[PDB]
């Protein structure tokens, strides 16, 4: 609809939902692929206590996938 | 797939463990009252003769119908689980059958029971008068210890070789199947048996004047180059700075005997306390090392017995 | 919107729907995650006491996507 | 929607319908979340009775979760 | 909802739906967090009988849960 | 009274849907807790029969969840 | 609704549609308790007959789930 | 419809699509759960080959679920 | 089952939908119960050659949700 | 019958959309079962280097149900 | 399908909505099958290397059913 | 087609909705399909150097399906 | 979106449904496989120390997914 304001009938709201789906799917799967870099820390501050350090960037990973997506989520979203 | 049937079958089975009070009363018995006494247990129920050779027998045979019975129970993505466990059992048959072919001495006195293959895999394997033929005859079953035979044997004809370099790499390749078939349980035993392994290379080879890297191998917990290369020089100091690991207990000690019983007590103790994570291939877990440990118990307390040998000498080996 | 009386919108009430998936897949898939580390985190005091702080640090990023998820569905609907 | 009383719009109630989705697909995730480390944290004591403290610190962090979930929902409904 | 037994609003009906699935939800949570950490719990009094109530006051932290969904639906239909 | 029907309605239909998550999502979270639960008692029975009791208080405990469900979807739709 | 010969009827049709949900549901939960069960029935009574007896009885308790999912939905459709 | 009704139309219909979701996820389970053991039970009846019939008898166990639930839509569907 | 006039109609169409549903829904049930079974069980041959007859046996029972789901579909949506 | 809802208007809708989903979920129910014959069968060809026939065929044996769901609502569609 | 922007109508309409949902769990299907195979295959092309063709021809098997719910999908769009 | 009620109408937007379908279920199911070989491939390239090339004519071939779905869609929903 | 969402219509609205479908794929897919990758390269950094580069370089693999995805979804707005 807007992403600040209550302007708006039924047309621009439904834009709304239908851009809501990306930020929905997108979240889902970020949260699964982290769980799985979180459990081969394990090793990864087992066996060396440097390759800790390697663990934290992975888990970043992911997320960059979402917050872009949802960039142009709340961009086109916004638009006039 | 699965393990939903086949740990159904093993809790059953978990119900005829001989429970720590049986080794207790055994102590106190001779050879005679020994005898009637084990033949109450599921061991007890594969016997064939009072003497030595068949307790050995009875005791074997026990294992190869309840535990190495195990992977062809399952397929699959189950299948590759079990059959890690599995997989050691395998590769002591494997050494010794390598052994019977390429020193030319019988297929007798050498270490048989199902696992992952079959009697008849190492009978077929036997038989073949090629090293690359054995090899593929051994690569039927499929799994992990067939890869790690076949790039060491690209490399060496060399019996003493062979062995060291398969048990290395096998290792290793477990370690990396095992770390992608996931769940916590089996991620700490893991970490344990193969920092009980390189603990242990590192007693077997010492002083032999070699590389102290090459007896760590990844999937520690404490443990580094370091701390082998003092071992190698005979400097035990190392072990009174190994706690936060379960090997606390093996501070302030120096004998090899009292540092490798303390190993296999502690690989004992993770695997028992996996049933509080039952799901999966935990409870098997649990399992095997309960029926391997077992085994053994009765094997020293038959021994024990039959020559009447001291009993502090077992009393002590036979608890953790 | 508001629970007191200072919003309307017939827009809005589809930005509701549409933000209902994001934070609640958000909050499913940030709790996926948080469980690898923390049974991860039983084996990190098992292995050694000292890096306690590893799991800690790891564990920490997770939360981000929930936090950012909260964020987003105020700026969409209840801003005003 | 709105806190006090049923809903007696139809803009009321599709709010409703989809707010729901958010506090629903959070519930499921706190559940989740708990389970692994939960059955891991018995285990924690089994081992170590001194850090049974250590386990349920975990398990508390899910129940932020749900929190996070409600009060989005909380506020949003009221109003259209 | 708040009213309804025999009949009510079509409008009734949606705030129905929506706050029906936070409860629903927080039951299959609870199973969830229930199926892993009660398991688990077999194992110990199978071990050691005595040591029945560790288990139980881990699982007694899921039952929360299925008390949260409850006032969410409790709150949204309507206030006591 | 609460949850009945003679004549049904159109309102009934969408009453109908809400009040169908809640048993339908309990009794699933229900049937996987108990199935756990169901497969470790078998090692309750089988290593000793002074646990054999304790086997059974587990296999009765995940049923209070479906109990509850019951209650919330016959209370909602029966309370004016 | 009606069970009484027939059950025909626009906004009948719409309660049938919000029940078989409800059933769908707690069917699906019965399937992977009643199944796993069963099985490992047939493991205790082959090793030992002295637990045969339990394996029967945990093989009915998973059948209550099914017909409380067909009762709801009875009830709602006119009555049994 | 079918042949022992006598009752169609859209009336009749709406009832029929609506009512087939429950047997459709009846099936889910119950397809779930049968495959699994039956995989494990291959296995069985290679052991036993005198009592290779408890094996099959298994089997038939999650049927019973997805059977009864046609039936009761039988009913429902038609009844005259 | 039949195209025609008389195995055909308007009024046909209405029991071809429930009718139609039976089989789909039984092949559903039927791919994922037969698949593990089948999967071990052919397995079971390549191994050992003496379990050939006994995996074609017990391969029926899962087929066996399918060929029902049919003889239901067939007989109603006959002709007359 | 077909799908239509101008060729038979409401009446006609109702079939149109319930037999979709008699294939869909025929599609879901083989699509799964393939991957665990697919997964098992990579075994078979490993141990038997010449029993390549015969992963091939047990393979064959989940499409069948596609071909079952798929013809059933092509025929009746058909119908005019 | 055939038609869908070629031609209008709700007749049309209908037709892509029921057949829609078969392609798309057919392509669903196809992606996990096709898939599993493969990672299963990464061990047979890296063990046996002069057996590598027959995981290949092994692995071209699910795309089948891809174009079996496609042909479907096509010829019922635009009419038969 | 578009999407429409008052843009136009009722035929057109029931097409709208039917093709989204097919995208939807597809993607669900090539999204699982890469990491199942990625995960694979690893230990292929650990073991022999020369193998890399083979993981990436896996990882490639589940890709084809969804994108082929995505551009039928395309010149489907880019017209009137 | 299309070319709006605060002056936007119902047209554009379908191509926010189409657009969600889109990231949500990219997202979804190319996280959970890269997660996979990032797993089980702890391993492949550490037994493989030299050739540590060849995991990262695996991990790039399905980063040309996410980026297909996006293209499909800036493609699909500014269309009919």
């Known amino acids: 609809?807007?992403?600040?304001?209550?302007?708006?009938?039924?047309?621009?709201?439904?834009?709304?939902?239908?851009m809501g789906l990306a930020v929905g799917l997108a979240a889902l799967g970020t949260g699964v692929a982290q769980?799985?870099?979180?459990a081969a820390g394990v090793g990864a501050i087992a066996e060396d206590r440097s390759?800790?350090?390697?663990?934290?960037?992975?888990?970043?990973?992911p997320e960059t996938l979402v917050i872009f997506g949802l960039l142009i989520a709340f961009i086109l979203n916004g638009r006039l | 797939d699965d393990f939903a049937y086949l740990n159904a079958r093993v809790r059953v089975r978990r119900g005829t463990l001989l429970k720590e009070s049986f080794f207790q009363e055994a102590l106190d018995l001779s050879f005679a009252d020994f005898l009637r006494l084990l033949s109450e247990t599921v061991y007890g129920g594969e016997l064939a003769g009072q003497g030595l050779p068949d307790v050995d027998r009875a005791v074997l045979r026990t294992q190869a119908k309840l535990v190495g019975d195990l992977p062809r129970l399952v397929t699959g993505e189950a299948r590759e689980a079990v059959r890690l466990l599995l997989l050691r059992n395998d590769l002591h048959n494997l050494q010794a059958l390598l052994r019977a072919k390429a020193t030319g001495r019988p297929f007798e006195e050498v270490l048989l029971l199902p696992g992952t293959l079959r009697e008849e895999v190492w009978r077929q394997a036997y038989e073949a008068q090629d090293p690359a033929?054995?090899?593929?005859?051994?690569?039927?079953?499929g799994h992990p210890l067939a890869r790690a035979l076949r790039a060491v044997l690209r490399e060496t004809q060399d019996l003493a070789r062979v062995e060291a370099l398969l048990a290395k790499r096998f290792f290793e390749d477990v370690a990396k199947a095992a770390k992608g078939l996931d769940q916590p349980a089996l991620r700490d035993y893991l970490a344990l048996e193969v920092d009980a392994e390189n603990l242990r290379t590192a007693f077997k080879?010492?002083?032999?004047?070699?590389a102290p890297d090459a007896f760590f191998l990844k999937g520690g917990r404490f443990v580094d180059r370091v701390r082998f290369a003092r071992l190698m020089e005979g400097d035990y100091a190392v072990l009174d700075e190994l706690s936060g690991t379960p090997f606390s207990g093996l501070s302030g000690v120096r004998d090899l005997k009292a540092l490798e019983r303390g190993l296999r007590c502690v690989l004992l103790k993770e695997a028992k306390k996996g049933v509080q994570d039952p799901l999966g291939v935990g409870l098997v877990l649990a399992y095997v090392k309960e029926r391997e440990w077992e085994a053994v118990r009765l094997r020293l307390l038959a021994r024990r017995a039959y020559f009447g040998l001291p009993r502090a000498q077992v009393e002590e080996e036979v608890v953790c």
Chains 1, 3, 4, 5, 6, 7, 8, 9, 10, 11, 12, 13 share one sequence.
Not at chain 1, 12 to 18: P, S
Not at chain 1, 35 to 38: E, L, Y
């Open chain 2, 133 to 141: 033929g054995m090899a593929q005859v051994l690569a039927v079953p």
């Open chain 1, 51 to 61: 390759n800790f350090g390697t663990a934290l960037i992975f888990l970043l990973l």
């Open chain 2, 205 to 210: 080879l010492q002083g032999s004047g070699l």
């Open chain 1, 1 to 18: 609809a807007e992403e600040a304001a209550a302007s708006g009938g039924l047309d621009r709201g439904l834009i709304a939902v239908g």
């Open chain 1, 35 to 38: 769980a799985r870099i979180g």
